[PDB]
Amino acid sequence: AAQTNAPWGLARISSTSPGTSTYYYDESAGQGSCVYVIDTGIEASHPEFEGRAQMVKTYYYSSRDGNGHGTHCAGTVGSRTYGVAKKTQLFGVKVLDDNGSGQYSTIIAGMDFVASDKNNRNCPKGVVASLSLGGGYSSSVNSAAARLQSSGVMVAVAAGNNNADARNYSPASEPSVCTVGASDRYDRRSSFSNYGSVLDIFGPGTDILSTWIGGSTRSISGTSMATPHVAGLAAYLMTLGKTTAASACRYIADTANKGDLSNIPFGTVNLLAYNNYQA
Ligand SMILES: [Ca+2]
Ligand SMILES: [Ca+2]
């Protein structure tokens, strides 16, 4: 399948080179997989989700995304026009308030919730969790991310936007999950992207068009935007049977575009998420 005039980030993950505008992907498109978006919520009624999104848990007064961030990330995972895995099932868990903030205890509870809730869902091709959030180092937050991964969920987390070593941020610094940095459309490390030895992979993160609340769209930037590209790619690859939740991060790194990025500090991987599609 081919989506013409795609957002640059989708085109980038299906090409060996920057500057293309078509997103090439297998028609299966993540069908049968499930992705939990752990964030500010998801505007499930947005036409772009085609009935494939639902809120399953909130830690606040409402399950509504009053911010937009969660809806944007969910759109990059699996919206029709802006998504990597266009037929996946999306589950929203609202651990962040409408200002985009949340206590660590709530974020931990949300991770533990997904590890249990997945046992009540029909996700034959597997389960992914996308965490476009983080803050200062916390061994408890790292431990929760490790538990979620251990339970059989592919966990993708944002490296953070401090232009610093991700070792000082959580859950970015948990080795066992998939920690995602951001790049721009000219294959440069995004100027804000964290780096360091704990990064596993880069994905498109600067000027990313996706869904927004009020049935709208907008373009924003961050490692928050790169993370759902990798989460969606994992769901896509698991549906194709190429990898499993336990090994998806490794498989993505193994099959990545290597050495394409500039402004990568020594000691940080030079690997860019790639779907290796061939018609
Ligand atoms: Ca290349
Ligand atoms: Ca890792």
Q: Which technique was used to obtain these atomic coordinates?
A: X-ray
Please provide residue 47's backbone torsions phi and psi, each rounded to the nearest 5 degrees.
-50, -30
Cα(1)–Cα(141) distance, integer angstroms: 39
- The ligand placed nearest to the CA atom of residue 269 is 2
Tell whether residue 93 is among the known ligand binding residues.
Answer: no
| Ligand in nearest proximity to the CA of 17 | 1
Structure tokens at 274: 């790639």
How far does residue 49's CA lie from ligand 1's centre (Å)?
A: 32
Range of the domain at 135: 1-279
| 39: annotated active-site residue | yes
Asked about 224 being catalytic, the answer comes back as yes
Backbone angles phi, psi at 26, to 5 degrees: -70, 135
42 alpha carbon – ligand 2 mean position (Å): 27
Resolution (A): 1.6
Q: Is 65 a catalytic residue?
A: no
Q: Which residues pair with 216 in a beta bridge?
A: 212
Q: Is 16 annotated as a binding residue?
A: yes
- CATH code for the domain in which residue 82 is found: 3.40.50.200
Query: Closest Cα partner for 171 from 202, 203, 205, 140?
Result: 140
Cα separation, 172 vs 167, in Å, equals 7
Task: Tell me how far the alpha carbon of residue 21 lies from the centroid of ligand 2, in angstroms.
Answer: 30
Residue in 46, 138, 224, 229 annotated catalytic: 224
Rg over alpha carbons for the chain, rounded to the nearest Å, is: 16
* Residue 19, SS3 per DSSP: coil
Q: How many domains does the chain have?
A: 1
- The CA 170 to ligand 2 mean position distance, Å, reads 12
Residues 45, 61: Cα–Cα separation, whole Å:
19
State the burial class of residue 99 (Cβ atoms within 10 Å of its Cβ: 0-12, 13-18, 19+). Answer: exposed
90 Cβ contact list (under 8 Å, min separation 6): 34, 35, 37, 42, 44, 49, 52, 53, 54, 74, 77, 78
Residue whose structure tokens are 């868990």: 93
Q: Annotated binding residue at 177?
A: yes
Token look-up 């180092």 returns 137
Q: Concatenate the DSSP letters of all residues of 192-257 into one string.
A: T--BSTT--EEEE-SSEEEEETTTEEEEE-SHHHHHHHHHHHHHHHHHTTS--TTTHHHHHHHTSE
3-state secondary structure 56-91: EEECCCCCCCCCCHHHHHHHHHHCCCCCCCCCCEEE
